[PDB]
Amino acid sequence: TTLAFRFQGGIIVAVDSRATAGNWVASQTVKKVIEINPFLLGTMAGGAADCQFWETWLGSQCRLHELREKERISVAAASKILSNLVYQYKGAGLSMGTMICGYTRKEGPTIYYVDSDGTRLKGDIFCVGSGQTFAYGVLDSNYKWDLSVEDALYLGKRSILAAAHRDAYSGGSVNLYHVTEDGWIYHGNHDVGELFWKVKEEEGSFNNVIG
Amino acid sequence: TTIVGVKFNNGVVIAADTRSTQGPIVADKNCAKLHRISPKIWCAGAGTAADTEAVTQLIGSNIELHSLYTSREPRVVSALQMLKQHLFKYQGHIGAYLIVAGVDPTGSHLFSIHAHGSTDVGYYLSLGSGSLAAMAVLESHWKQDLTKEEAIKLASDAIQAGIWNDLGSGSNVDVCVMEIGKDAEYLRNYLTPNVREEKQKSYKFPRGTTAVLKESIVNICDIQEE
Amino acid sequence: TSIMAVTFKDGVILGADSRTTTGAYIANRVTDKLTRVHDKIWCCRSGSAADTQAIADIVQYHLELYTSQYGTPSTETAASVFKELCYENKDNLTAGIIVAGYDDKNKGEVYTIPLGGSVHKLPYAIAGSGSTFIYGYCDKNFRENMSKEETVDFIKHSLSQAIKWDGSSGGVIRMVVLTAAGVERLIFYPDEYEQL
Amino acid sequence: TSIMAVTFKDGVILGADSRTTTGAYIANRVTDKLTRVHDKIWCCRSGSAADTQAIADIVQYHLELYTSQYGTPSTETAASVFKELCYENKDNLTAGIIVAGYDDKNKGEVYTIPLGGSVHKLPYAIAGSGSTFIYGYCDKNFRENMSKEETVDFIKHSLSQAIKWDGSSGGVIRMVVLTAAGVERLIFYPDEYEQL
Amino acid sequence: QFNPYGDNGGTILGIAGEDFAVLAGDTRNITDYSINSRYEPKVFDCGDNIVMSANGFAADGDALVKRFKNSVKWYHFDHNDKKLSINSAARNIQHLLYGKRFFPYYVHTIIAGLDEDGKGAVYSFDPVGSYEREQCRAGGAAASLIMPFLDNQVNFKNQYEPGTNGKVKKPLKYLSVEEVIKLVRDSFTSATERHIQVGDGLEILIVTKDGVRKEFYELKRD
Amino acid sequence: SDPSSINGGIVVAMTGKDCVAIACDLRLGSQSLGVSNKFEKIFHYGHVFLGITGLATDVTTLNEMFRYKTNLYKLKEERAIEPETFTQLVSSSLYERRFGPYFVGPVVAGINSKSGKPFIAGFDLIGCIDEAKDFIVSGTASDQLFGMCESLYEPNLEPEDLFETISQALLNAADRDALSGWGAVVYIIKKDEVVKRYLKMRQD
Amino acid sequence: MDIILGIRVQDSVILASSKAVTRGISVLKDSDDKTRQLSPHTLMSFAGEAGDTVQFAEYIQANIQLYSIREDYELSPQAVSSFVRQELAKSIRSRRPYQVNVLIGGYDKKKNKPELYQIDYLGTKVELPYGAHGYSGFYTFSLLDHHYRPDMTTEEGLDLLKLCVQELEKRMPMDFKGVIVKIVDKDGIRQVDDF
Amino acid sequence: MDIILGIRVQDSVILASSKAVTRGISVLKDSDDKTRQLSPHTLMSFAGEAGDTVQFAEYIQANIQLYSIREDYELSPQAVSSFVRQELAKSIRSRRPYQVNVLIGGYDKKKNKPELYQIDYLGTKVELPYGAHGYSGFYTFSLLDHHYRPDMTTEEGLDLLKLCVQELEKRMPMDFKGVIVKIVDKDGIRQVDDF
Amino acid sequence: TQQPIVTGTSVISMKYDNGVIIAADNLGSYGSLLRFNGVERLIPVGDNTVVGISGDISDMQHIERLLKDLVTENAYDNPLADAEEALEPSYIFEYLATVMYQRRSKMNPLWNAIIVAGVQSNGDQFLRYVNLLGVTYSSPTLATGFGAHMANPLLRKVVDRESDIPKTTVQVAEEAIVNAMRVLYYRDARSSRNFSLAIIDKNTGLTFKKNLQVENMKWDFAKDIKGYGTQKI
Amino acid sequence: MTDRYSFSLTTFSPSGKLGQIDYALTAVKQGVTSLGIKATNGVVIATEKKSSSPLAMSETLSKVSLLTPDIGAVYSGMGPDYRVLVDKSRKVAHTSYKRIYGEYPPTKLLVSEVAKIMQEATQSG
Ligand SMILES: [Mg+2]
Ligand SMILES: [Mg+2]
Ligand SMILES: [Mg+2]
Ligand SMILES: [Mg+2]
Ligand SMILES: [Mg+2]
């Protein structure tokens, strides 16, 4: 499960950390946020290799742009380089659902959902992966433009936790990021096992679960 | 699975490995594959394991009833005829492949039977995934007029070829010997060439390692008096 | 599989190889494909081993019960019982059967019952996968009213060629001689027939 | 189809039936399946009529060009050109070709090129659907160094049997005799060969 | 219809220590229910203090290792004998794998060595080149038998301090090379008992600042 | 699609010194969706314990069927059914549905009340009895369980050491299976007392 | 059909069911009641295959009404749910199975407790504080996991329900035309006719 | 995507396009604008396969903008629609065809007439008084056939449109999240931001 | 992609103390028809290597022509062609393995299984396998097709691990190989009685035996076997 | 044909007697004496082999019968009725017990099954 949303203080990016092959849990420590450069983040869903390979490639294209133009690449342009690339491969079997996240002067905080069938969507809240519907529920009912950076980070953490609990293929740990105009800031790895009990006690949620 | 049957002078011997698998996983390292149809008629099965057991029990039961009815000791040809007519009726859907061996008032016998209901006679046979490894040994060393000792040796060597060369087969050798005019001797774990070596480290846990929410006493008794 | 049956002056002789395969594996190299359904009525089996054994056992039962009530059955009668089983169950059977028997009135007779359950009375018959390679040879070399020894040679030479070319055929050549004299089993080994 | 080629003391003889079928319909009953690729190098064709005609025409071209530059090609060389075409295009061809030729150094030679494009030098060769029925007959009756007349008889008797049993084979028996003397075409009609 | 892939069995295991790394693999090579070889080495020294194993379909595994060794050689030619760091090798292998994205090398690759601070490093790859640095990774046939063990005995998952009943976790103490080798051998002994494709021999390559050492142990041969 | 991995779940049983244990996760799901965290997969009929993994409707149906049969057994025989006898009853009942089978992986655990011998057994969906001395495993994380059990198990553990071994075997196996977890129960079984312990585990 | 939800609060069970009936291309009806009263204190909502849903529900209702008359007694929700489960388990190995999923909400007058049972077409039964069938749980369970308390009032239950239906109306592609809501408590069954 | 409608009245063309974007199970967006301005007096709305719709539309827009700069002249709606049709006809025999359906609404400044062209993914072009793609016509055409007059005002056109969208919202199973409406007339292109 | 048409069955081989032995029968099957009886499937390359090939015969003949062209090309501008720069078994194998893997990677395999047997310059035994997939491996015994299932188990009783090789003589090894060929003739429906055998020894060089026959066959017990269960006469 | 005796041949008489059962007991009274004795470490059952003629080989007529390896039976009354009950008793020990539980039934339960068979012959048509 991966999400990203815009707010007053920039962008929150939150992801789980589980990778599965069938019912086999291959890893609990996967990195689903790929650090394209110090100002741009991309999320990993669908094909792990496709997302990894093409989003680090995207970082190389962004670097060349800023060498040739002596200016930070826009999120619009960065996302379009990727969407035009995957569109060239349409039909070949690429699998990729990603949010390209950044915060520039001219645009403000911006998120583009990019897809392997060529879709490119600008938006305020996106949620992608096997647990996306669980994350959307928490997110939709608690989202406000005027969230504090602290509450925004929590909301993102809590939305992923909801998915990790209900979705069999989501879990492990929660990675958090905050994207500002001066770059992204990492806000740590949070084991879902320990997080779940802590949230249950402090919040009084998950009464259904015995603790 | 490797299973063989070998005729000798005054009887017949059967043997089997002891590994049972679930796909590529070993479920039981010491399975007993040698089953009893009657005291002096034994068999071993490959294919669908529940079918070989079920079909063995069904015919074993009917053989006992037949023996009681006729006041005669069971014959191998009766076990064979009943197995093949049962299997033929189900058109191979009962996946039983068997080597059947035994002695009776008529003599010593050795038969194979295939899931669709065909049967074969022979002096030496093999069955299972290790059947080609075993048959290589049987075809190399078998001769007419073997002694009991040579037959046990040959049969167990044939199983060993399966154990070492077939991934489907493993662990130990079980043997059953049926000599004319004697009790059948079932030799469980006749060979033991695969002891697990001692591990490097004990994985016994300190008590209290595991986190617990609740304990309760389970009432396994019936309703108490008074 | 290579099977055949040949009428001659004193009766009939059945012949067969001894190989049965599971794919390319020889599951049994000393099979007996010549089966007794009555004292002097025998058959050669081809197709599904399960089917032909089941049929043969049922026919042996019918003829044993026929004998008890009506005395010795004719070879024609035995073929008719085989036919009934093969024809009525054609959807579920893969059986190619040659029926060969000796009467005192009728002498040696041969009936072939191919896949569909039709019946054909013939002076001689050949069947099984290996038979395809000896249609030319058998047609050119068969005569009516051969002696026992000529007939043994004809069958030996024929099945020798079938075995040579057909991978599904091989092992020993078995034969069963049916005459007024009785019932004689013959066997011929590779070293004898290979160098013919 | 029934085709064969047999080496004998003075050279080699090719033989064939004349039937080509579309299913059960005889589309041509007087086909010529013996084709010339050089003066004394001929081939018999089996499989796809389109494929084997195309290949034969290409080989005739290669050997005509070989001859212009390097003089008369060997039978081995002709077989090698056939092989190259059959092997490199195995995915798109259904061709079974027997190549037969006469040299003065090498005498009569026969090469069979089956489906996959392998090559096999043999004293004689048989192919086509009808050949299956005469493996036994041909193996028993072929000798080395037969005379012209014995070889004509061997081929006639062999193809007569193939025609008798194989529905895809029939019509007239054509033969081509290749010796130092030259090239002789023979033809034999049903009334001659049927009653052998 | 032609199947260009096969499965040659085998199991591999890479563990990263404080200042060392181990990469182990059984030496059995199989197809279906047959043994091709009881000793066909599967873990290789690739130069520059890097060890590599590519498990699954052996023809692809050999092709990949052989291309990577070649890449090390050309790295030296093109960059003045500069030593190829483990992170740079990992990135390079991703490109070797992804170059065949639409006709993949059917293998699970693991490399082991030391990072640029002398700390132990293990990298794990999927067939099409997604990779990550990991402390612990089993690959191949018995991976699902081995990983949960390692979760429990290396990371001490689900183990709490006695008397605290679930409040204090068992602390993650640092492992020596002798301790790691014990876990590796017990891992392969258990896998050998319970998986028909694992057996015959265990070959372990240990990487330190002093280079690459090799250890071998017999496993049951049934 | 595969009926035995729609709902998820695992069961493991082990023998020790004069005792047996049997444990199970508590998850019931519809593929990726977790539906219930209180779906117990271990049942008992007198002093014989039965764990069942697989398709949950069949788990429920079989429990109700064996309760039925062991209740009639008790009324007729005037004694509680023993583990060896029950094992044969399970095998028979499953095989009687040979061509339309229940999609389950049952596990039997108990102590023979006369001989005092600890007993375990496992079955495939069609009745084949696996009668290992050491341990039996079943469910969607069975490969992981075979891994844990093979390395952690040693013979003749005392009841409270056996508890830790089987608990750790189940827990770490469940954490490597998407369709298992969401809680766990462990039964420790001695000749006259049985204790049941719920484990604390991660809830993802 | 499509969405059916249930939630058990302190002293009652609330069942919400969508109103739309769709025959492929057209919405035929926007006021369909996907429920049957099995007894005065037991309600069953249902969703699955056309025809089979109503046939199954009415067949169950007939059987429970028959039991009630024969014994002059109302079966407990637990007993009704076990009967229903057995019928669905029986059906899954039939010639042509009932493809029907149900929620059973009842108030047990003996134990003075509300009870909610979730049963799918295979006969998979579970007792829950809140439940759903199909894709409904995917959108609503994270809200229920967050807000649900076992001591909620009926009104708090309805408000949590409004929040669930609003999330469904936002994120679900199909227009299910709102829901009909019914409450089961100690006084029986009533419909909330403004939602 | 889903619904696109167009209607040509006396002196303008009105295009209505749905706002929803659905990726299978979730509605990802409820404010998507499925249109591109090709020139100051020509508008194209589009629907079909994900990715291809926007790629096609932006490619067309780029080509028309290039023509405008090169000639310092605006192509007539008829000429733009013929160019678009040729591209789609070219694509249908390609290796991988654009699966994209479009409506082109333009005001021709030379003839002083509004014009509506309907073009499907095969390159089937038709000039119409009103048009739609997909299933939209099945629900709306009987209303348009009834009420449409060639001399309607812009406001009467919008009212007939409200009636069309209301029928779609009643009878269509999918929730398409309303429509964005745009008007093309002699003064160019504007959006009606209350519908 | 294709399908094999004319095929050869097992090739079997093993190491002994001073060299290697390799054997293969002389049959070319056409499905179940035993069409061709004089097919040589062991091809010696120089005097230190023998390549044994099973599978498709047309592809074998193609490989045969590649090896014969290898020898020609290696002698070009090479004064040490018959000395220090002669073809080694290891060179010949790596070349074949390269070709096999390339062909599978073009989805156009050479439909064969190949064993390269020989002795290296330094006297070391060479024995390695490659097939249509490009899969390669080494073992003290190697066999293809049926031989893998029936010959390896017998040959492994003689040489079971690396340390058994110095203890095994050319006579024990040859006799094991010949026995295995008998067993394959008994049990493989696509085998023939006639076979070729080659020994490459570090002292005595390459010995190549043609027209060997399987002998000492046990068939006598067949006479006592009657019916398929109950039958008597 | 078809068995058209689908009504009871044993019925209550006005005094509450089941005639056919009493008459069956009378046939048992005429029967040769048989007995059983239970000891602490075994049971013995015995009877007289009253041979009909001295030319009869009386060992070929078994009055005491193995039902299971641990259960035996003897009788008094009609021998042929006994012989068929033994056949049925042996079979029911398998069909309704051994094929289910994998072990032979306990004495009382086999007795219970034999008794049921005999009861049904007292009420069935
Ligand atoms: Mg680009
Ligand atoms: Mg083995
Ligand atoms: Mg003809
Ligand atoms: Mg989860
Ligand atoms: Mg159109």
PDB file of N, CA and C in Angstrom, chain B residues 19-67:
ATOM      1  N   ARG B  19      10.583 -42.830   2.730  1.00  0.00           N
ATOM      2  CA  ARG B  19      10.273 -41.410   2.545  1.00  0.00           C
ATOM      3  C   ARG B  19       8.902 -41.229   1.896  1.00  0.00           C
ATOM      4  N   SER B  20       8.041 -40.431   2.524  1.00  0.00           N
ATOM      5  CA  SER B  20       6.803 -39.973   1.886  1.00  0.00           C
ATOM      6  C   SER B  20       6.869 -38.460   1.701  1.00  0.00           C
ATOM      7  N   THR B  21       6.520 -37.999   0.501  1.00  0.00           N
ATOM      8  CA  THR B  21       6.688 -36.598   0.125  1.00  0.00           C
ATOM      9  C   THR B  21       5.363 -35.879  -0.119  1.00  0.00           C
ATOM     10  N   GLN B  22       5.377 -34.568   0.107  1.00  0.00           N
ATOM     11  CA  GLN B  22       4.317 -33.663  -0.330  1.00  0.00           C
ATOM     12  C   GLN B  22       4.932 -32.711  -1.344  1.00  0.00           C
ATOM     13  N   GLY B  23       4.849 -33.068  -2.622  1.00  0.00           N
ATOM     14  CA  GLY B  23       5.569 -32.339  -3.659  1.00  0.00           C
ATOM     15  C   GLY B  23       7.063 -32.530  -3.444  1.00  0.00           C
ATOM     16  N   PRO B  24       7.828 -31.423  -3.349  1.00  0.00           N
ATOM     17  CA  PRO B  24       9.259 -31.541  -3.060  1.00  0.00           C
ATOM     18  C   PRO B  24       9.612 -31.582  -1.561  1.00  0.00           C
ATOM     19  N   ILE B  25       8.606 -31.608  -0.688  1.00  0.00           N
ATOM     20  CA  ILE B  25       8.830 -31.598   0.760  1.00  0.00           C
ATOM     21  C   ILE B  25       8.672 -32.996   1.357  1.00  0.00           C
ATOM     22  N   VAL B  26       9.584 -33.362   2.257  1.00  0.00           N
ATOM     23  CA  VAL B  26       9.494 -34.621   2.998  1.00  0.00           C
ATOM     24  C   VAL B  26       8.565 -34.437   4.199  1.00  0.00           C
ATOM     25  N   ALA B  27       7.410 -35.097   4.168  1.00  0.00           N
ATOM     26  CA  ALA B  27       6.451 -35.031   5.273  1.00  0.00           C
ATOM     27  C   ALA B  27       6.814 -36.019   6.380  1.00  0.00           C
ATOM     28  N   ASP B  28       7.112 -37.256   5.987  1.00  0.00           N
ATOM     29  CA  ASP B  28       7.496 -38.312   6.924  1.00  0.00           C
ATOM     30  C   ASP B  28       8.794 -38.963   6.452  1.00  0.00           C
ATOM     31  N   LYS B  29       9.808 -38.931   7.311  1.00  0.00           N
ATOM     32  CA  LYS B  29      11.115 -39.506   6.996  1.00  0.00           C
ATOM     33  C   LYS B  29      11.153 -41.017   7.207  1.00  0.00           C
ATOM     34  N   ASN B  30      10.187 -41.551   7.953  1.00  0.00           N
ATOM     35  CA  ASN B  30      10.161 -42.979   8.259  1.00  0.00           C
ATOM     36  C   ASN B  30       8.757 -43.577   8.106  1.00  0.00           C
ATOM     37  N   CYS B  31       8.183 -43.414   6.916  1.00  0.00           N
ATOM     38  CA  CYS B  31       6.898 -44.024   6.571  1.00  0.00           C
ATOM     39  C   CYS B  31       7.056 -45.532   6.397  1.00  0.00           C
ATOM     40  N   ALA B  32       6.080 -46.293   6.883  1.00  0.00           N
ATOM     41  CA  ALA B  32       6.023 -47.732   6.635  1.00  0.00           C
ATOM     42  C   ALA B  32       5.114 -47.986   5.433  1.00  0.00           C
ATOM     43  N   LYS B  33       5.713 -48.364   4.306  1.00  0.00           N
ATOM     44  CA  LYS B  33       4.983 -48.552   3.045  1.00  0.00           C
ATOM     45  C   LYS B  33       4.574 -50.004   2.794  1.00  0.00           C
ATOM     46  N   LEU B  34       5.135 -50.927   3.572  1.00  0.00           N
ATOM     47  CA  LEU B  34       4.802 -52.347   3.464  1.00  0.00           C
ATOM     48  C   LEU B  34       3.526 -52.634   4.248  1.00  0.00           C
ATOM     49  N   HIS B  35       2.443 -52.926   3.529  1.00  0.00           N
ATOM     50  CA  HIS B  35       1.155 -53.211   4.153  1.00  0.00           C
ATOM     51  C   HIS B  35       0.803 -54.684   4.064  1.00  0.00           C
ATOM     52  N   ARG B  36      -0.108 -55.087   4.940  1.00  0.00           N
ATOM     53  CA  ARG B  36      -0.538 -56.465   5.068  1.00  0.00           C
ATOM     54  C   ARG B  36      -1.942 -56.609   4.491  1.00  0.00           C
ATOM     55  N   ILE B  37      -2.088 -57.439   3.461  1.00  0.00           N
ATOM     56  CA  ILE B  37      -3.414 -57.823   2.966  1.00  0.00           C
ATOM     57  C   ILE B  37      -3.945 -58.948   3.854  1.00  0.00           C
ATOM     58  N   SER B  38      -3.086 -59.928   4.113  1.00  0.00           N
ATOM     59  CA  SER B  38      -3.353 -60.991   5.080  1.00  0.00           C
ATOM     60  C   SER B  38      -2.000 -61.402   5.672  1.00  0.00           C
ATOM     61  N   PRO B  39      -1.991 -62.261   6.711  1.00  0.00           N
ATOM     62  CA  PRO B  39      -0.732 -62.577   7.399  1.00  0.00           C
ATOM     63  C   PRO B  39       0.463 -62.881   6.489  1.00  0.00           C
ATOM     64  N   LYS B  40       0.238 -63.643   5.422  1.00  0.00           N
ATOM     65  CA  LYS B  40       1.315 -64.038   4.507  1.00  0.00           C
ATOM     66  C   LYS B  40       1.152 -63.465   3.097  1.00  0.00           C
ATOM     67  N   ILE B  41       0.337 -62.420   2.967  1.00  0.00           N
ATOM     68  CA  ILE B  41       0.211 -61.681   1.713  1.00  0.00           C
ATOM     69  C   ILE B  41       0.427 -60.203   2.009  1.00  0.00           C
ATOM     70  N   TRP B  42       1.549 -59.675   1.532  1.00  0.00           N
ATOM     71  CA  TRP B  42       1.928 -58.293   1.788  1.00  0.00           C
ATOM     72  C   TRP B  42       2.038 -57.537   0.472  1.00  0.00           C
ATOM     73  N   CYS B  43       1.872 -56.222   0.539  1.00  0.00           N
ATOM     74  CA  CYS B  43       1.984 -55.384  -0.644  1.00  0.00           C
ATOM     75  C   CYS B  43       2.559 -54.020  -0.307  1.00  0.00           C
ATOM     76  N   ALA B  44       3.001 -53.323  -1.346  1.00  0.00           N
ATOM     77  CA  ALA B  44       3.531 -51.974  -1.222  1.00  0.00           C
ATOM     78  C   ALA B  44       3.017 -51.150  -2.387  1.00  0.00           C
ATOM     79  N   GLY B  45       2.718 -49.881  -2.131  1.00  0.00           N
ATOM     80  CA  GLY B  45       2.063 -49.039  -3.121  1.00  0.00           C
ATOM     81  C   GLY B  45       2.807 -47.772  -3.487  1.00  0.00           C
ATOM     82  N   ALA B  46       2.690 -47.396  -4.757  1.00  0.00           N
ATOM     83  CA  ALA B  46       3.094 -46.085  -5.240  1.00  0.00           C
ATOM     84  C   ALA B  46       1.849 -45.405  -5.798  1.00  0.00           C
ATOM     85  N   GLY B  47       1.982 -44.147  -6.199  1.00  0.00           N
ATOM     86  CA  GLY B  47       0.844 -43.378  -6.697  1.00  0.00           C
ATOM     87  C   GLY B  47       0.138 -42.650  -5.570  1.00  0.00           C
ATOM     88  N   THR B  48      -1.181 -42.520  -5.684  1.00  0.00           N
ATOM     89  CA  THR B  48      -1.985 -41.815  -4.686  1.00  0.00           C
ATOM     90  C   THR B  48      -2.037 -42.631  -3.391  1.00  0.00           C
ATOM     91  N   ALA B  49      -1.389 -42.119  -2.346  1.00  0.00           N
ATOM     92  CA  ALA B  49      -1.157 -42.876  -1.108  1.00  0.00           C
ATOM     93  C   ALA B  49      -2.435 -43.310  -0.387  1.00  0.00           C
ATOM     94  N   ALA B  50      -3.454 -42.456  -0.397  1.00  0.00           N
ATOM     95  CA  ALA B  50      -4.744 -42.790   0.212  1.00  0.00           C
ATOM     96  C   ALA B  50      -5.443 -43.921  -0.539  1.00  0.00           C
ATOM     97  N   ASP B  51      -5.276 -43.949  -1.860  1.00  0.00           N
ATOM     98  CA  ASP B  51      -5.841 -45.014  -2.689  1.00  0.00           C
ATOM     99  C   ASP B  51      -5.171 -46.361  -2.428  1.00  0.00           C
ATOM    100  N   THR B  52      -3.849 -46.368  -2.269  1.00  0.00           N
ATOM    101  CA  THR B  52      -3.130 -47.622  -2.023  1.00  0.00           C
ATOM    102  C   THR B  52      -3.495 -48.193  -0.653  1.00  0.00           C
ATOM    103  N   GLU B  53      -3.628 -47.318   0.343  1.00  0.00           N
ATOM    104  CA  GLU B  53      -4.047 -47.727   1.687  1.00  0.00           C
ATOM    105  C   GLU B  53      -5.495 -48.216   1.694  1.00  0.00           C
ATOM    106  N   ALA B  54      -6.395 -47.413   1.131  1.00  0.00           N
ATOM    107  CA  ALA B  54      -7.825 -47.742   1.098  1.00  0.00           C
ATOM    108  C   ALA B  54      -8.106 -49.059   0.377  1.00  0.00           C
ATOM    109  N   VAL B  55      -7.450 -49.250  -0.764  1.00  0.00           N
ATOM    110  CA  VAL B  55      -7.678 -50.424  -1.605  1.00  0.00           C
ATOM    111  C   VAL B  55      -7.081 -51.668  -0.936  1.00  0.00           C
ATOM    112  N   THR B  56      -5.981 -51.468  -0.213  1.00  0.00           N
ATOM    113  CA  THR B  56      -5.346 -52.523   0.577  1.00  0.00           C
ATOM    114  C   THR B  56      -6.251 -52.974   1.726  1.00  0.00           C
ATOM    115  N   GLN B  57      -6.841 -52.015   2.437  1.00  0.00           N
ATOM    116  CA  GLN B  57      -7.725 -52.327   3.563  1.00  0.00           C
ATOM    117  C   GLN B  57      -9.010 -53.006   3.099  1.00  0.00           C
ATOM    118  N   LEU B  58      -9.596 -52.506   2.011  1.00  0.00           N
ATOM    119  CA  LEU B  58     -10.847 -53.053   1.486  1.00  0.00           C
ATOM    120  C   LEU B  58     -10.691 -54.517   1.077  1.00  0.00           C
ATOM    121  N   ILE B  59      -9.661 -54.803   0.286  1.00  0.00           N
ATOM    122  CA  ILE B  59      -9.408 -56.168  -0.183  1.00  0.00           C
ATOM    123  C   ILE B  59      -8.921 -57.058   0.963  1.00  0.00           C
ATOM    124  N   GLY B  60      -8.128 -56.497   1.875  1.00  0.00           N
ATOM    125  CA  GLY B  60      -7.695 -57.225   3.070  1.00  0.00           C
ATOM    126  C   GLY B  60      -8.875 -57.677   3.916  1.00  0.00           C
ATOM    127  N   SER B  61      -9.855 -56.789   4.062  1.00  0.00           N
ATOM    128  CA  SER B  61     -11.092 -57.081   4.783  1.00  0.00           C
ATOM    129  C   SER B  61     -11.915 -58.169   4.093  1.00  0.00           C
ATOM    130  N   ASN B  62     -12.120 -58.026   2.785  1.00  0.00           N
ATOM    131  CA  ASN B  62     -12.877 -59.016   2.013  1.00  0.00           C
ATOM    132  C   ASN B  62     -12.148 -60.357   1.900  1.00  0.00           C
ATOM    133  N   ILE B  63     -10.817 -60.318   1.881  1.00  0.00           N
ATOM    134  CA  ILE B  63     -10.007 -61.540   1.885  1.00  0.00           C
ATOM    135  C   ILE B  63     -10.199 -62.314   3.191  1.00  0.00           C
ATOM    136  N   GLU B  64     -10.220 -61.595   4.311  1.00  0.00           N
ATOM    137  CA  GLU B  64     -10.428 -62.216   5.619  1.00  0.00           C
ATOM    138  C   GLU B  64     -11.803 -62.877   5.698  1.00  0.00           C
ATOM    139  N   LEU B  65     -12.834 -62.161   5.256  1.00  0.00           N
ATOM    140  CA  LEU B  65     -14.192 -62.708   5.220  1.00  0.00           C
ATOM    141  C   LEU B  65     -14.275 -63.936   4.315  1.00  0.00           C
ATOM    142  N   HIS B  66     -13.619 -63.864   3.159  1.00  0.00           N
ATOM    143  CA  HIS B  66     -13.569 -64.988   2.227  1.00  0.00           C
ATOM    144  C   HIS B  66     -12.888 -66.206   2.856  1.00  0.00           C
ATOM    145  N   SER B  67     -11.778 -65.961   3.547  1.00  0.00           N
ATOM    146  CA  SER B  67     -11.011 -67.020   4.204  1.00  0.00           C
ATOM    147  C   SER B  67     -11.823 -67.709   5.305  1.00  0.00           C
TER     148      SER B  67
END
